[PDB]
Amino acid sequence: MLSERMLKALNDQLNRELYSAYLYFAMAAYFEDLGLEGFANWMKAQAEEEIGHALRFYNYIYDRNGRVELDEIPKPPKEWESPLKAFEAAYEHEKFISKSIYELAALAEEEKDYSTRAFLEWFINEQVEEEASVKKILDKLKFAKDSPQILFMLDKELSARAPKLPGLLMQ
Amino acid sequence: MLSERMLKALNDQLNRELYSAYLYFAMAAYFEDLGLEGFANWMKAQAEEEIGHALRFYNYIYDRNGRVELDEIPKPPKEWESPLKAFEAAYEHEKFISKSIYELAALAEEEKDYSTRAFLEWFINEQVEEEASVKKILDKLKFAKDSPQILFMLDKELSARAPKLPGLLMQG
Amino acid sequence: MLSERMLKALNDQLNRELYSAYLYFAMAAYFEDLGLEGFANWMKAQAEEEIGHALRFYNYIYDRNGRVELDEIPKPPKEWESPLKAFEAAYEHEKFISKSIYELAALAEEEKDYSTRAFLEWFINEQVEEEASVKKILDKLKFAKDSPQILFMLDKELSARAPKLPGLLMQG
Amino acid sequence: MLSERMLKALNDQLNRELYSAYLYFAMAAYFEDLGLEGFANWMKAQAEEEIGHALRFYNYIYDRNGRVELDEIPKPPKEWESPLKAFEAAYEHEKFISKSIYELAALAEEEKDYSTRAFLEWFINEQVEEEASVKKILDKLKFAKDSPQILFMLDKELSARAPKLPGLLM
Amino acid sequence: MLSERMLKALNDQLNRELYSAYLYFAMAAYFEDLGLEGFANWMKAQAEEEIGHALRFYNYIYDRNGRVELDEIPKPPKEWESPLKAFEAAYEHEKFISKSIYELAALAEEEKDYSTRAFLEWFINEQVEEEASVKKILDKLKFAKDSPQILFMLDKELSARAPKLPGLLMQG
Amino acid sequence: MLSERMLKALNDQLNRELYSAYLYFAMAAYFEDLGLEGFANWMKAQAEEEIGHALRFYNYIYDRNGRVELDEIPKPPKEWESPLKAFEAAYEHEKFISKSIYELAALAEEEKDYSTRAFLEWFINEQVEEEASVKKILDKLKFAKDSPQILFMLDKELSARAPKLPGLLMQG
């Protein structure tokens, strides 16, 4: 049974993963407006993964006989200056998620909660991949400062990643 | 292309659809606490359908040369007195979503926007199926007022419906 | 190689895992007497998992060039007041095993034995599922205290899980 | 119904079959220490067969409307002098189990319990094969007194028999 | 991103893993000279594994926005007194590698670098297999001190493991 | 059997082929830092071929009743000014390897060792492909002087060549 402090910290991170989903959905909207479908689809697919992360906290909380409480999801930013500046904000946010993960692991070790600490190990390993994934595209946008030719080709490469949910629901 | 008023109304329903998902995810949390996994999974699967609806508004807006602006999703209720009262609030919310769809349809007809009127036609037919889906279970919960035996057998029946996203994501 | 104290702690937990199997085989005997074959077969299948847990400690010890010493397995309780009380005792024992896994993890971190700490990681994660598995059925038995109808339906649901060994040995 | 005397006699043999499983799990630990992996796996596979035998007594007791009571399982020996002495102890144990099966068959015929007697027939036939299986390897260990070469080749021969349970759970 | 001390430490282990590969390649040459083709091929297959372990460090460094710097690889021992002594030096080196992995794990915990600590968990679990794999054969060589008959039979048993790279490159 | 002077020259080339692998693994690290994953993967695949060349010398030496002695592998360069200058160094090194192959062939003809001369015939033909493979890409980098657009498109062309070892080793 989780301590009152730990249950709150897991519930807060559940909200953070859900906001991460919403931020990337907001970024998808921004890229769609610029007519960049590849970047937009990539962001929708990334947003779906963040929903999965939230469900993992949901599942673990109930595995430890806890109770999930959903807080509000704040309004995300509407616009960014350039596709480059959107990924810089995406990378800064990924480091924010990792930092909140580290503080969860540090809290679990301080309370001697081995179950939560072992559970968080999935996300520590996961955030390494996601930070590297976002950084890889960020550096390619630094590589094409005043080049619309490369940004066009980047859009085609990222179009390979698409959201998996859309084609499974009603129609 | 869309008027300033129509774009605002479409963006607001996009926000209303995303809240529906979050409200059903809150009900999923409520049923999970009671140890009712069947109801909980049914709600998660329903929440996914609402995200699908929000994506349909997202898609239409950009098809009409508009712009999507995401508003905040408000905090949903944590608890309900009973599973019966939980579905009563869900059916009440389904009528609220249906009502806001009608108001969009009226606004489209008033502005003579035939494209937006034809688009909303899918949701008018969809909401008939969703209202009846929630009402069907509601009546079955009314049918089992002081009977946990039926509530247990109802849980098994709704466990046939499951969320489709969890099994496809990054996994471990 | 392992320290004298660490080897003793791994040998002790190996004995605990074997007793867990023996306790659930005793619970299987309890439920079988009441005619609850589904509960009985669930406990038998659970007992086999605990024997599997014991063999994982066995295998690790010899991977670290240690030696397994088998201690006696004590007599388990014969009877319980109810199917509910039997699962209350099971969940209490599942917290007992989890605690001794934590104490082993703390001992590995104290003796900076990174290999044993990494080995115990499997059991920390495994015990989260085990506790949630037992607690789930415990809550369902609280759900039907004066209801023999649901106890009958719960017995059929647990009969889906069966032991895997019996069909593989000498047949007759 | 089973007689009060017969029920305790079936519960005690159920406990003996569980100790048999625990004794071969102890011998497996001894062979694993010597680096004889084939001997260890053979013993683990034999240990599973004894659990199967214990379940057979479990199933029979409940078929006759009886009640199973589980007693404690005593601590088995940790070490033996040689692989030969380990099998000499195992063969002595198989004769001990066979004898306790005979006394159950003698008790069944005395009380005119034809049901228990007919049930024990499977175990009389099983122990003939069990004793011959252990004795066969024992004689081969006598055949290789001061020969590590043949002990190495015997290890590979017994590695063909492996425990069936481990690969099925989690 | 990695600290200056952590980056240097990860680069060092990358070099240690590459030397391990070069050491087992040197042992392969030693066993090839004695005409023990099974032992030699076992060592070649083990050498490839260590290269893969070096690539796993390489991949992690660039994932954490770091830079890989490749230092020189020292000359390995040419000869050993016996196959028993050759595996004794191998099992000793396995304890050296496991040791340096612990130092990295102790470093990560001191910096609170959870990412590197979580990354190193794979190598801790891997080295348990590695040590047990080498020790198993070492004990079989202790088991056959003055017996060329068992050394011949061991050579055939280890010939089952063969290097995987050769049959994939440019041929002729 | 081989002469002392020939055996040293074969062992020296075996060291050169292993450095060729270590140099290209250093180039792969340089390209990976720039984010050019295709170039990096091309080099890793090329390094594996050099290890394969080294094993051909290893195999031949023992076929002639010789003894392989592994020397130290020196530290390779960390950086290059540009991808263009990186391939200019690679092509210069390829001519260096070919020259040492020519000198080995001249030594075999002078000593009247037909077996080594026949063995080296494979490497004379192999180096023709190797030089032409590097020169082809070098000229294309000369072609993309002030163009990041062509460098991006070259990266994709070379991403088709990938290392074969990583997907066969111990995994997790």
Ligand SMILES: [Ag+]
């Ligand atoms: Ag729908």
Ligand SMILES: [Ag+]
């Ligand atoms: Ag993920």
Ligand SMILES: [Ag+]
């Ligand atoms: Ag398990």
Ligand SMILES: [Ag+]
């Ligand atoms: Ag049998």
Ligand SMILES: [Ag+]
């Ligand atoms: Ag032989």
Ligand SMILES: [Ag+]
């Ligand atoms: Ag080649």
Ligand SMILES: [Ag+]
């Ligand atoms: Ag490995």
